[PDB]
Amino acid sequence: RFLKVKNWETDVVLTDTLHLKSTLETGCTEHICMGSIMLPVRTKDQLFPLAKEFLDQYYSSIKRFGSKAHMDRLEEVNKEIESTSTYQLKDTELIYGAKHAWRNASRCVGRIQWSKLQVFDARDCTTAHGMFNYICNHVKYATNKGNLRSAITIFPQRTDGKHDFRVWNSQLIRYAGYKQPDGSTLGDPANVQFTEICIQQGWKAPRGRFDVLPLLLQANGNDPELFQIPPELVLEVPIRHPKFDWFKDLGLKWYGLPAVSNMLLEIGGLEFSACPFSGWYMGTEIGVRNYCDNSRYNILEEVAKKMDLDMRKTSSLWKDQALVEINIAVLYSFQSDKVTIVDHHSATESFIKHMENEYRCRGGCPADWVWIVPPMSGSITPVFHQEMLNYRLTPSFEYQPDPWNTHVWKG
Amino acid sequence: RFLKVKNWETDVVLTDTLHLKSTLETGCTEHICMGSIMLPTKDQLFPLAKEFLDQYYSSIKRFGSKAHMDRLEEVNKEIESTSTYQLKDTELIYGAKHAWRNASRCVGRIQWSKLQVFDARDCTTAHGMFNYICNHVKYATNKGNLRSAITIFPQRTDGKHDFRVWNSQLIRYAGYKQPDGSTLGDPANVQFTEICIQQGWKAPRGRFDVLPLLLQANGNDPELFQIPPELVLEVPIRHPKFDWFKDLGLKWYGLPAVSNMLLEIGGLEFSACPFSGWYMGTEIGVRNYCDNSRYNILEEVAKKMDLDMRKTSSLWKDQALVEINIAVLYSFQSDKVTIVDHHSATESFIKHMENEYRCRGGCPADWVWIVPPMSGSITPVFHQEMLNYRLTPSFEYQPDPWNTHVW
Ligand code: HEM
Ligand code: HEM
Ligand SMILES: Cc1cc(N)nc(CCc2cncc(CCc3cc(C)cc(N)n3)c2)c1
Ligand SMILES: Cc1cc(N)nc(CCc2cncc(CCc3cc(C)cc(N)n3)c2)c1
Ligand SMILES: Cc1cc(N)nc(CCc2cncc(CCc3cc(C)cc(N)n3)c2)c1
Ligand SMILES: Cc1cc(N)nc(CCc2cncc(CCc3cc(C)cc(N)n3)c2)c1
Ligand SMILES: OC[C@@H](O)[C@@H](O)[C@H](O)[C@H](O)CO
Ligand SMILES: OC[C@@H](O)[C@@H](O)[C@H](O)[C@H](O)CO
Ligand SMILES: [Cl-]
Ligand SMILES: [Cl-]
Ligand SMILES: [Zn+2]
Ligand SMILES: [Zn+2]
Ligand SMILES: [Zn+2]
């Protein structure tokens, strides 16, 4: 089967054959599209096919499909599974796997960069202190004094599901949120629940607007343990505006390193429940989502008030005006401080080039339009008019529930 | 069976049961989501008729009544004998309102029950079509206080006698390929303009020439008519702060009137069913003005604003976009022509969606179209999960008639 996508600005048509390798399910059926739904121990039996599918893909990528090395690796893994009920990836397969999970991440507009990912193998890690050390090293390597480098750190895989490695933080670096008795929130409302857990685990909260959360790290299914990232490793950018000198007095800053720490990496049927990965920001993530979402820092009113916009009616587009100025400020600040950031015009133009290249060289590029289109100025970016096909390829990154919901407490 | 949708800003959760009554296919499968693809006999007709008449009688609280059974009987008899049937006026009005109610891509559905339905099933000629359309246009326009309306021409019979409006909207601007290489006017309408000229239209060859109607009655070859200039309300575009803005010479028409879609009710197909509402500001200022394949004015505006156009990261495009959209809204408001901004429209849709969930058990919605083309996440629809599915009565896309018509 060939599936066509059209771009409605350019009339360019592409043909997808890669979807034929799709395996997992979308949530959609012939009767219902779930395209805007955010969330729409294995057996030896199911595992060897998953292993084999992966190793066939790996060995094809290196032009060794069907080689003795390929056949021998299949035999080796087969016997490891039947004898130990799981298997270990070779380092090269781990690197390939992690790179492909990113390449396959359909919500990620930054995938042009997928082949340039530093993979840190932390499968020898045994303790939460060990995890803390690996995470500091990742942070320092990825930050690179503002010249950001993409990285992933991979902790030991799931065994029986009772010995999971987990990072309880949603991101390595994130700000605390504190619900006040009057119902207001100090800091970042997205992180209230996790902040409460940290405090219950013994963190002494500074109780300010931008407190970097401690790491809460679980090794080998044990109860998690608190660690503070050395402050000198957390690069932050104070936010100012190129023309509005009062913008700085809003007291805003953000951290430079976006590092997702709550997802599960599946490679060849193996599950890496702790696999923190990081890149660099697209400006709208800070300027649109983190600052202007109503359930986040929610700064639109204050900015608009300081700008003396007409706020009596929505039709003056005061919210749109303030939004643009905040996003200008974020890009200006990061650039002035020499911290890697990409604007949404650059990011989306690069994604479309990536996507076209993928169609030609790979036969497709699964993409989730809902997430790929930027949260402001959508239609003036080249992704808006691009038709996309969303399907799930493995290796992959997957959502997993927050660990406090599932963890069996030891005491 | 029971499906939940969550709002990620407000944590509010809603349960959809209405999707169980969905019928047409989405284009998606369990393997591949096509959510972002724009276009993804006697035996068949009676189940469709029955399904519709059942919902109708249910809606007037007379389900299973003798008048219900008698009507099903009557329609059955009519299909067996004529191979089609005629809707009662009451059923026609209901079906048209519900086709709007069911339009998953429409953000303006809070208005669905206030639709003026003009029954043009007695129309027989292209001239008759023109009269009906001028009357629709004048009624809907209403000196700028716009009123939603649909005009419904005779249903499809054997498919060789279709009524069609060849225009994509009742009011739209011509587009002309220039010897220059560029496009004068609206590039969206280049092909249709050519057909008009080929059919004999004398084109003024300007930037905003209102297209003539090309009307097809009874499967006959389509004929040209010019809408009375005085029935076409237009708005010159100015900005409340930028004096130079008016000198771009921009204008738009007040009446958005889709004329190329097919209305399906109870299995019957109305291939000519122009309908109209009023604009959301971004439709003109973001889409019509700023799409690269449309009037594409971003560069000229940014230039007049003297923005740094050297690097994308100055966000000059975003700045010019906002200003263009401010001017569209200000111009329509100053001339007292109905228009809605995207903040107000999306807020009203969320309110409508909650109503529909509570009263109907759901509201099919296509997030890709419902989220405005600018400032998406600061509107209340962005964080709203939506379920997309197809209910009948419905409005369907149909191919442009020049691909299909035999002359
Ligand atoms: C290098 C620069 C990168 C940029 C500019 C970038 C940009 C983005 C953006 C804007 C999103 C969606 C956020 C939203 O719409 O709310 C996203 C999501 C995502 N990215 Fe990338 N990203 C980058 C690197 C990476 C890396 C290194 C990985 C993994 C190795 C990755 C994997 C993902 C995944 C799995 C998602 C979905 C996240 C989720 O479901 O929560 N990205 N990225
Ligand atoms: C009264 C105010 C109305 C508003 C503000 C409104 C708004 C809109 C908008 C913004 C779109 C999509 C435009 C885009 O995102 O590019 C749309 C699409 C649509 N609307 Fe509404 N509309 C209104 C009236 C109506 C009426 C009266 C009907 C039918 C009686 C209707 C049926 C539809 C349909 C079928 C679509 C999808 C059209 C297509 O597929 O091309 N709308 N509307
Ligand atoms: C319920 C739920 C499901 C899901 N799949 N993801 C989320 C979190 C979405 C999310 C929120 N803030 C931030 C991110 C990070 C996106 C991101 C990741 C990377 C690696 C780089 C970059 N520039 N940006 C992701 C929530
Ligand atoms: C667990 C959880 C709870 C909660 N209340 N909110 C969240 C974050 C939801 C959220 C809000 N804004 C942004 C995102 C990023 C994901 C995202 C979602 C959509 C719909 C579009 C798009 N471009 N990106 C996610 C997560
Ligand atoms: C290939 C294709 C498929 C499809 N279903 N629609 C289209 C046209 C989409 C389209 C473009 N401009 C304008 C409209 C009309 C939208 C519209 C309709 C009404 C009635 C009111 C209002 N405010 N806005 C629709 C193209
Ligand atoms: C027949 C036809 C050909 C062509 N090349 N373009 C078109 C118009 C395509 C088009 C471009 N921008 C906007 C729209 C409106 C429909 C629309 C599409 C999407 C993806 C989001 C959204 N909010 N609204 C339609 C139609
Ligand atoms: O405060 C807890 C939240 O940060 C957490 O539930 C996240 O939203 C979740 O991990 C999704 O990223
Ligand atoms: O030139 C004709 C086009 O406007 C026409 O093909 C439309 O794009 C089509 O009717 C869909 O709106
Ligand atoms: Cl957002
Ligand atoms: Cl658009
Ligand atoms: Zn958001
Ligand atoms: Zn789908
Ligand atoms: Zn567009």
Short mmCIF file of C-alpha atoms in Angstrom, two decimals, chain B:
data_model
loop_
_atom_site.label_atom_id
_atom_site.label_comp_id
_atom_site.label_asym_id
_atom_site.label_seq_id
_atom_site.Cartn_x
_atom_site.Cartn_y
_atom_site.Cartn_z
CA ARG B 1 -17.99 2.30 24.20
CA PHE B 2 -17.85 5.11 26.77
CA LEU B 3 -15.11 7.58 25.85
CA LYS B 4 -13.58 10.28 27.99
CA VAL B 5 -12.16 13.63 26.87
CA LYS B 6 -10.07 15.77 29.18
CA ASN B 7 -9.33 19.45 29.20
CA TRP B 8 -5.63 19.84 30.13
CA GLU B 9 -6.01 23.45 31.38
CA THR B 10 -9.11 22.88 33.59
CA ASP B 11 -8.86 19.12 34.35
CA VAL B 12 -12.59 18.86 33.48
CA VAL B 13 -13.46 15.40 32.07
CA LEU B 14 -16.43 14.69 29.76
CA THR B 15 -17.95 11.38 28.66
CA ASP B 16 -18.89 10.86 25.03
CA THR B 17 -21.62 8.36 24.22
CA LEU B 18 -22.80 9.99 20.98
CA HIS B 19 -19.97 8.48 18.91
CA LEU B 20 -21.79 5.16 19.18
CA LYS B 21 -24.30 6.58 16.69
CA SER B 22 -21.49 7.41 14.22
CA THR B 23 -21.86 5.91 10.80
CA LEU B 24 -19.49 7.12 8.04
CA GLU B 25 -15.76 6.18 8.15
CA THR B 26 -12.95 8.50 9.40
CA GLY B 27 -9.99 7.46 7.25
CA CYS B 28 -8.04 6.34 10.35
CA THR B 29 -7.28 2.75 11.34
CA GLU B 30 -5.75 1.17 14.43
CA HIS B 31 -2.44 1.34 12.54
CA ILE B 32 -2.50 4.89 11.11
CA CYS B 33 -4.15 8.16 12.11
CA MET B 34 -5.21 10.37 9.21
CA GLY B 35 -6.43 13.21 11.43
CA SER B 36 -4.38 15.73 9.49
CA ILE B 37 -5.41 14.62 5.97
CA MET B 38 -7.78 17.18 4.43
CA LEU B 39 -9.63 14.60 2.25
CA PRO B 40 -9.21 11.20 4.01
CA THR B 41 -30.39 2.33 -5.08
CA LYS B 42 -33.61 1.25 -3.32
CA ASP B 43 -31.81 -1.16 -0.94
CA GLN B 44 -29.44 1.41 0.57
CA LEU B 45 -31.87 4.33 0.73
CA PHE B 46 -34.57 3.03 3.09
CA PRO B 47 -32.20 2.21 6.01
CA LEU B 48 -30.78 5.71 5.63
CA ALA B 49 -34.29 7.24 5.52
CA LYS B 50 -35.37 5.17 8.57
CA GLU B 51 -32.27 6.15 10.55
CA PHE B 52 -33.01 9.81 9.83
CA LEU B 53 -36.78 9.63 10.49
CA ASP B 54 -36.15 7.80 13.76
CA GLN B 55 -33.86 10.61 14.96
CA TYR B 56 -36.36 13.22 13.78
CA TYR B 57 -39.35 11.65 15.58
CA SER B 58 -37.23 11.11 18.65
CA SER B 59 -36.28 14.82 18.54
CA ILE B 60 -39.97 15.90 18.65
CA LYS B 61 -40.68 13.31 21.38
CA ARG B 62 -42.96 11.21 19.15
CA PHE B 63 -40.79 8.13 18.68
CA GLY B 64 -42.73 4.89 18.14
CA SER B 65 -45.92 6.93 17.65
CA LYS B 66 -48.47 6.18 14.96
CA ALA B 67 -47.44 9.40 13.13
CA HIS B 68 -43.84 8.05 13.26
CA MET B 69 -44.87 4.59 11.93
CA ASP B 70 -47.19 6.15 9.32
CA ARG B 71 -44.36 8.35 8.04
CA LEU B 72 -41.89 5.45 7.84
CA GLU B 73 -44.60 3.48 6.01
CA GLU B 74 -45.23 6.40 3.62
CA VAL B 75 -41.53 6.87 2.83
CA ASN B 76 -41.00 3.15 2.31
CA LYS B 77 -43.91 3.14 -0.18
CA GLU B 78 -42.51 6.18 -1.96
CA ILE B 79 -39.01 4.69 -2.31
CA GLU B 80 -40.33 1.32 -3.61
CA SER B 81 -42.36 3.19 -6.23
CA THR B 82 -40.32 6.28 -7.20
CA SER B 83 -36.82 5.08 -6.19
CA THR B 84 -36.53 8.22 -4.03
CA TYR B 85 -38.62 10.29 -1.59
CA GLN B 86 -39.38 13.89 -0.63
CA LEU B 87 -38.69 15.39 2.76
CA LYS B 88 -41.44 17.28 4.60
CA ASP B 89 -40.52 20.92 5.23
CA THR B 90 -40.14 20.12 8.94
CA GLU B 91 -37.67 17.28 8.14
CA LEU B 92 -35.74 19.48 5.72
CA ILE B 93 -35.28 22.26 8.32
CA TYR B 94 -34.31 19.71 10.98
CA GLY B 95 -31.86 17.94 8.68
CA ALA B 96 -30.17 21.21 7.66
CA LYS B 97 -29.83 22.38 11.24
CA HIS B 98 -28.34 19.04 12.19
CA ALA B 99 -25.93 18.92 9.31
CA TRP B 100 -24.50 22.14 10.84
CA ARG B 101 -24.72 20.70 14.39
CA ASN B 102 -22.71 17.71 13.13
CA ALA B 103 -19.99 19.63 11.25
CA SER B 104 -16.95 18.61 13.29
CA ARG B 105 -14.72 21.27 11.69
CA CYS B 106 -16.97 24.22 12.52
CA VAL B 107 -16.08 26.35 15.55
CA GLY B 108 -19.28 28.41 15.20
CA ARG B 109 -21.79 25.64 16.04
CA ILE B 110 -23.16 27.35 19.19
CA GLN B 111 -25.37 29.04 16.59
CA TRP B 112 -26.60 25.81 14.95
CA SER B 113 -30.27 26.03 15.88
CA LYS B 114 -30.61 29.59 14.53
CA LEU B 115 -30.24 28.82 10.87
CA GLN B 116 -32.68 30.31 8.35
CA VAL B 117 -33.50 27.58 5.87
CA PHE B 118 -34.63 28.63 2.42
CA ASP B 119 -36.37 25.85 0.60
CA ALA B 120 -35.52 26.18 -3.10
CA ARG B 121 -36.62 22.66 -4.12
CA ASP B 122 -39.13 24.21 -6.54
CA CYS B 123 -36.27 25.78 -8.54
CA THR B 124 -35.94 24.51 -12.11
CA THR B 125 -33.58 26.81 -13.98
CA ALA B 126 -30.28 28.58 -13.56
CA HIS B 127 -32.07 31.88 -13.63
CA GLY B 128 -34.28 30.69 -10.72
CA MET B 129 -31.07 29.71 -8.86
CA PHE B 130 -29.65 33.19 -9.34
CA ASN B 131 -32.79 34.84 -7.88
CA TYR B 132 -32.75 32.49 -4.85
CA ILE B 133 -29.06 33.24 -4.29
CA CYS B 134 -29.43 37.00 -4.48
CA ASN B 135 -32.25 36.69 -1.94
CA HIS B 136 -30.08 34.55 0.34
CA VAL B 137 -27.22 37.02 0.01
CA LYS B 138 -29.40 40.02 0.88
CA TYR B 139 -31.12 38.21 3.76
CA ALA B 140 -27.88 36.88 5.29
CA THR B 141 -26.07 40.22 4.85
CA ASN B 142 -28.89 42.26 6.41
CA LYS B 143 -26.98 45.57 6.09
CA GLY B 144 -24.05 44.12 8.08
CA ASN B 145 -25.96 42.51 10.92
CA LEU B 146 -25.32 39.04 9.47
CA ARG B 147 -27.77 36.15 9.81
CA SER B 148 -26.93 32.50 9.21
CA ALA B 149 -28.76 31.02 6.21
CA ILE B 150 -28.86 28.01 3.87
CA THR B 151 -30.66 27.81 0.51
CA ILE B 152 -31.45 24.23 -0.59
CA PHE B 153 -31.91 23.36 -4.28
CA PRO B 154 -33.53 20.15 -5.61
CA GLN B 155 -31.97 16.84 -4.54
CA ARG B 156 -29.95 14.49 -6.78
CA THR B 157 -32.05 12.13 -8.87
CA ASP B 158 -30.09 9.89 -11.30
CA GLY B 159 -26.91 11.96 -10.91
CA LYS B 160 -27.24 13.26 -14.48
CA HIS B 161 -29.50 16.15 -13.46
CA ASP B 162 -27.50 17.66 -10.59
CA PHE B 163 -27.95 21.22 -9.39
CA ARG B 164 -24.52 22.70 -8.64
CA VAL B 165 -23.06 26.06 -7.78
CA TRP B 166 -19.69 25.88 -9.56
CA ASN B 167 -18.26 28.64 -7.29
CA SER B 168 -16.60 27.46 -4.04
CA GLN B 169 -18.18 30.43 -2.13
CA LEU B 170 -21.03 32.72 -3.31
CA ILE B 171 -18.75 35.66 -2.90
CA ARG B 172 -15.05 35.33 -3.82
CA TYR B 173 -12.35 37.21 -5.71
CA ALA B 174 -10.92 36.38 -9.15
CA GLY B 175 -7.34 35.22 -9.65
CA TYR B 176 -5.28 35.82 -12.82
CA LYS B 177 -1.89 34.46 -13.93
CA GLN B 178 0.18 37.46 -15.04
CA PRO B 179 2.60 37.58 -18.03
CA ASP B 180 4.78 38.87 -15.15
CA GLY B 181 4.82 35.31 -13.68
CA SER B 182 3.02 36.44 -10.54
CA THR B 183 -0.66 36.20 -9.66
CA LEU B 184 -3.02 39.15 -9.61
CA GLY B 185 -5.95 38.77 -7.22
CA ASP B 186 -6.67 35.58 -5.25
CA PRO B 187 -4.48 32.62 -6.32
CA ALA B 188 -7.03 30.17 -4.81
CA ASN B 189 -9.43 30.98 -7.68
CA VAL B 190 -7.22 30.94 -10.72
CA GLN B 191 -8.76 27.85 -12.32
CA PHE B 192 -12.37 28.87 -11.64
CA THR B 193 -11.70 32.39 -13.01
CA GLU B 194 -10.38 30.79 -16.24
CA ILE B 195 -13.54 28.71 -16.63
CA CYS B 196 -15.56 31.91 -16.15
CA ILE B 197 -13.58 33.72 -18.84
CA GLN B 198 -13.83 30.65 -21.15
CA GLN B 199 -17.62 30.70 -20.52
CA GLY B 200 -17.67 34.37 -21.57
CA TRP B 201 -17.11 36.51 -18.43
CA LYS B 202 -15.55 39.91 -19.12
CA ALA B 203 -12.93 40.01 -16.36
CA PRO B 204 -12.03 43.48 -15.00
CA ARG B 205 -8.50 42.11 -14.27
CA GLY B 206 -8.15 43.73 -10.82
CA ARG B 207 -7.00 42.56 -7.41
CA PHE B 208 -10.46 42.14 -5.84
CA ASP B 209 -12.93 41.37 -8.65
CA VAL B 210 -16.04 39.69 -7.22
CA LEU B 211 -16.52 36.51 -9.28
CA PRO B 212 -19.72 35.88 -11.24
CA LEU B 213 -21.88 32.95 -10.26
CA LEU B 214 -21.71 29.94 -12.53
CA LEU B 215 -24.92 28.08 -11.94
CA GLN B 216 -25.92 24.59 -13.03
CA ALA B 217 -29.57 23.58 -13.01
CA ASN B 218 -30.92 20.09 -13.69
CA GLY B 219 -27.59 18.78 -14.97
CA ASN B 220 -27.62 21.43 -17.71
CA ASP B 221 -24.46 23.25 -18.70
CA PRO B 222 -23.78 26.00 -16.13
CA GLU B 223 -24.64 29.67 -16.91
CA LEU B 224 -23.05 32.95 -15.77
CA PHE B 225 -24.74 35.60 -13.63
CA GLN B 226 -23.30 38.66 -11.88
CA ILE B 227 -24.44 39.29 -8.29
CA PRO B 228 -25.88 42.80 -8.00
CA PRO B 229 -22.87 44.89 -6.87
CA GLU B 230 -25.07 46.57 -4.27
CA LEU B 231 -25.78 43.17 -2.56
CA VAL B 232 -22.08 42.50 -1.96
CA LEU B 233 -21.06 44.17 1.27
CA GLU B 234 -17.29 44.77 1.42
CA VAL B 235 -15.03 46.31 4.08
CA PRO B 236 -11.92 48.41 3.35
CA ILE B 237 -9.14 47.35 5.74
CA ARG B 238 -7.52 49.98 8.01
CA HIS B 239 -5.59 49.84 11.31
CA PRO B 240 -6.54 51.87 14.43
CA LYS B 241 -2.91 53.08 14.85
CA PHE B 242 -1.06 52.60 11.56
CA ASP B 243 -2.15 55.33 9.15
CA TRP B 244 -0.27 53.74 6.24
CA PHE B 245 -2.25 50.48 6.55
CA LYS B 246 -5.17 51.73 4.43
CA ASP B 247 -2.70 52.43 1.60
CA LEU B 248 -2.11 48.70 1.09
CA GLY B 249 -5.50 48.93 -0.63
CA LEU B 250 -6.82 45.82 1.12
CA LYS B 251 -10.52 44.94 1.45
CA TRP B 252 -12.60 41.79 2.06
CA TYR B 253 -16.27 40.84 1.70
CA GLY B 254 -18.47 40.47 4.77
CA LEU B 255 -20.34 37.28 3.84
CA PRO B 256 -18.67 33.86 4.05
CA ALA B 257 -20.89 31.54 2.08
CA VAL B 258 -19.80 28.04 1.25
CA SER B 259 -21.34 26.89 -1.98
CA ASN B 260 -19.43 23.74 -3.10
CA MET B 261 -20.53 21.18 -0.49
CA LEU B 262 -23.14 18.41 -0.50
CA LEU B 263 -25.86 18.17 2.13
CA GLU B 264 -26.90 14.60 2.94
CA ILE B 265 -30.19 14.15 4.80
CA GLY B 266 -31.90 10.75 5.28
CA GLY B 267 -29.89 9.34 2.37
CA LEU B 268 -31.03 12.14 0.04
CA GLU B 269 -28.26 14.26 -1.52
CA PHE B 270 -28.52 18.02 -2.01
CA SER B 271 -25.59 18.88 -4.28
CA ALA B 272 -26.40 22.62 -4.30
CA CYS B 273 -26.93 23.99 -0.80
CA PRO B 274 -25.03 27.23 -0.31
CA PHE B 275 -24.79 28.23 3.35
CA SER B 276 -23.39 31.27 5.11
CA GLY B 277 -22.56 32.63 8.54
CA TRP B 278 -20.14 35.40 9.51
CA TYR B 279 -16.35 35.49 9.69
CA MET B 280 -13.90 34.73 12.46
CA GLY B 281 -11.26 37.46 12.04
CA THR B 282 -8.33 35.06 11.57
CA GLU B 283 -10.01 33.56 8.47
CA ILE B 284 -9.34 36.86 6.67
CA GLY B 285 -6.26 38.21 8.46
CA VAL B 286 -4.35 34.92 8.94
CA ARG B 287 -5.54 32.58 6.14
CA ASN B 288 -6.74 34.78 3.26
CA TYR B 289 -4.15 37.52 3.77
CA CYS B 290 -1.10 35.57 4.98
CA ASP B 291 -1.11 32.07 3.53
CA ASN B 292 1.78 31.87 1.07
CA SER B 293 -0.58 30.66 -1.66
CA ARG B 294 -3.14 33.42 -0.97
CA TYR B 295 -2.67 37.24 -0.89
CA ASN B 296 0.61 36.61 0.95
CA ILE B 297 0.99 40.12 2.40
CA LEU B 298 3.22 39.39 5.40
CA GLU B 299 6.40 40.76 3.79
CA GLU B 300 4.82 44.08 2.66
CA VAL B 301 3.27 44.72 6.08
CA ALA B 302 6.46 43.93 8.04
CA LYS B 303 8.30 46.33 5.67
CA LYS B 304 5.88 49.18 6.35
CA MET B 305 6.28 48.48 10.09
CA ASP B 306 10.07 48.66 9.55
CA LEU B 307 10.75 45.44 11.45
CA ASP B 308 14.10 43.66 11.39
CA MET B 309 13.46 41.10 8.68
CA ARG B 310 17.02 39.80 8.75
CA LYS B 311 16.44 36.86 11.09
CA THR B 312 13.32 34.83 11.80
CA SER B 313 14.03 35.09 15.53
CA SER B 314 13.09 38.80 15.74
CA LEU B 315 9.60 37.34 15.22
CA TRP B 316 8.82 40.01 12.56
CA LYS B 317 6.35 37.63 10.89
CA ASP B 318 4.49 37.13 14.17
CA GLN B 319 4.38 40.86 14.84
CA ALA B 320 3.01 41.69 11.39
CA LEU B 321 0.49 38.83 11.69
CA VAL B 322 -1.02 40.24 14.89
CA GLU B 323 -1.30 43.75 13.41
CA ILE B 324 -2.99 42.48 10.25
CA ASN B 325 -5.52 40.67 12.41
CA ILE B 326 -6.06 43.70 14.61
CA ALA B 327 -6.86 45.76 11.47
CA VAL B 328 -9.32 43.17 10.09
CA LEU B 329 -11.29 43.16 13.35
CA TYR B 330 -11.17 46.96 13.73
CA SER B 331 -12.38 47.53 10.14
CA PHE B 332 -15.35 45.14 10.40
CA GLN B 333 -16.34 46.54 13.80
CA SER B 334 -16.07 50.17 12.61
CA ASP B 335 -18.35 49.47 9.67
CA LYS B 336 -20.81 47.50 11.90
CA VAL B 337 -20.35 44.25 10.00
CA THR B 338 -20.63 41.10 12.15
CA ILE B 339 -17.27 39.46 12.89
CA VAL B 340 -15.98 37.34 15.74
CA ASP B 341 -12.43 37.22 17.11
CA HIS B 342 -10.80 33.84 17.75
CA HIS B 343 -10.79 34.31 21.54
CA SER B 344 -14.53 34.97 21.66
CA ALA B 345 -15.36 32.27 19.05
CA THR B 346 -13.37 29.47 20.76
CA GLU B 347 -14.70 30.35 24.21
CA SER B 348 -18.23 30.08 22.78
CA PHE B 349 -17.38 26.73 21.19
CA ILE B 350 -16.17 25.32 24.51
CA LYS B 351 -19.45 26.46 26.07
CA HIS B 352 -21.32 24.83 23.17
CA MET B 353 -19.30 21.62 23.50
CA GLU B 354 -20.15 21.32 27.24
CA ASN B 355 -23.85 21.91 26.37
CA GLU B 356 -23.71 19.19 23.71
CA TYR B 357 -21.99 16.75 26.05
CA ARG B 358 -24.64 17.31 28.74
CA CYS B 359 -27.71 17.44 26.42
CA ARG B 360 -26.63 15.17 23.54
CA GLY B 361 -23.85 12.98 24.96
CA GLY B 362 -21.11 14.50 22.80
CA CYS B 363 -19.92 16.83 20.11
CA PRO B 364 -17.77 15.59 17.23
CA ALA B 365 -14.90 18.00 16.70
CA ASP B 366 -11.81 18.11 14.53
CA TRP B 367 -9.06 19.77 16.61
CA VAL B 368 -6.91 20.43 13.54
CA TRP B 369 -9.60 22.78 12.15
CA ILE B 370 -11.11 23.99 15.41
CA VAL B 371 -7.85 25.44 16.82
CA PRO B 372 -7.39 28.93 15.28
CA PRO B 373 -4.45 29.36 12.89
CA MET B 374 -2.73 31.83 15.24
CA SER B 375 -2.25 32.01 19.03
CA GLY B 376 -3.61 28.45 19.34
CA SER B 377 -2.59 27.59 22.91
CA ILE B 378 -3.90 30.80 24.45
CA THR B 379 -7.44 29.87 23.29
CA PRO B 380 -9.53 27.41 25.31
CA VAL B 381 -9.88 24.85 22.48
CA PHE B 382 -6.16 24.07 22.29
CA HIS B 383 -6.01 22.10 25.53
CA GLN B 384 -9.41 20.50 24.94
CA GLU B 385 -9.34 16.87 23.82
CA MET B 386 -11.82 16.31 21.02
CA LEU B 387 -13.24 13.15 19.45
CA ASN B 388 -13.76 13.27 15.69
CA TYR B 389 -16.42 11.11 14.14
CA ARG B 390 -19.03 11.44 11.40
CA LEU B 391 -22.76 11.85 12.12
CA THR B 392 -25.52 12.32 9.55
CA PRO B 393 -27.19 14.61 8.40
CA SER B 394 -23.87 16.02 7.18
CA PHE B 395 -22.09 18.40 4.89
CA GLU B 396 -19.62 16.59 2.67
CA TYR B 397 -16.85 17.76 0.34
CA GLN B 398 -17.59 16.94 -3.31
CA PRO B 399 -15.28 17.34 -6.28
CA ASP B 400 -15.33 20.53 -8.38
CA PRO B 401 -17.95 20.13 -11.14
CA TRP B 402 -15.66 20.86 -14.12
CA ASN B 403 -13.83 17.58 -13.43
CA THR B 404 -17.17 15.70 -13.66
CA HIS B 405 -19.51 17.67 -15.92
CA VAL B 406 -20.05 16.56 -19.51
CA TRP B 407 -20.73 19.56 -21.80
#
